[PDB]
Structures are given as structure tokens and as C-alpha cells.
Design a protein around this nucleic acid. Structure first.
Ligand code: ZN
Ligand code: ZN
Ligand code: ZN
Length: 85
DNA sequence: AGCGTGGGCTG
DNA sequence: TCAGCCCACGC
């Protein structure tokens, strides 16, 4: 952890500089990415991409066992486990 | 379920 | 730096 967080009201530490810069947005409240469909702003581009799928209904990740589709890979990951029990 | 959102990390 | 994943946790 060669880089720490300046805001006295926070005890965070990171390995990289790009990480401390992305983190700082938590405190500055920066939300650079806007959804053109609902106008909601997001702190991250990747979260904006998946959020947009809530409007379009796009579901790229299908369960290997039943084929049920999901907007995000982690949603599918959480689901696949139910085929055990 | 639906889905917000930060951390770790790759490229 | 940004882009874009996985991963994780929360409600
Ligand atoms: Zn901080
Ligand atoms: Zn939207
Ligand atoms: Zn399934």
C-alpha cells in the first residue's frame, strides 16, 4: 500500500495510483457517466453499462444448466449454485 | 430476483 | 488515465 487516502475522515490504502484516484470519487461525489435513457449519473463506466441493460433487457449470460439469462456475470454465478441445492 | 457500487487487477 | 472484467456485499 504505497498510496493512502488524504481525506482525514477515511482510513483507506491502495496498491496503485489509478485506484486511489477512482476511490477519491467516493468523497468528491463525482459521477462522470450518464445514462441517456433515464439520465441517472454513475461513478463508473462499467456500472453504467450494466445499468443500461435494465432498460434494454439485454441478458448476455446464460446458465450452463438451465439456460436462464442474466444481465451480469455475477447474477448468473449466484444463480448457477441453486442447481446443487 | 434486480441491481447499486467499491476493490483488485488486467490491458 | 481510462476501459472493462471479476468479485463481493448490500438492500
Ligand atoms: Zn477515502
Ligand atoms: Zn438509465
Ligand atoms: Zn440455471
Amino acid at each position: 500500500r504505497p498510496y493512502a487516502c488524504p481525506v482525514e475522515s477515511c482510513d483507506r490504502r491502495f496498491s496503485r495510483s489509478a485506484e486511489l484516484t477512482r476511490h477519491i470519487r467516493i468523497h468528491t461525489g463525482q459521477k462522470p457517466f450518464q445514462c441517456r435513457i433515464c439520465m441517472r449519473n454513475f461513478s463508473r463506466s462499467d456500472h453504467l453499462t450494466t445499468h443500461i441493460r435494465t432498460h434494454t433487457g439485454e441478458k448476455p449470460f446464460a446458465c450452463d444448466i438451465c439456460g436462464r439469462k442474466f444481465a451480469r456475470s455475477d447474477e448468473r454465478k449466484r444463480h448457477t449454485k441453486i442447481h446443487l441445492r
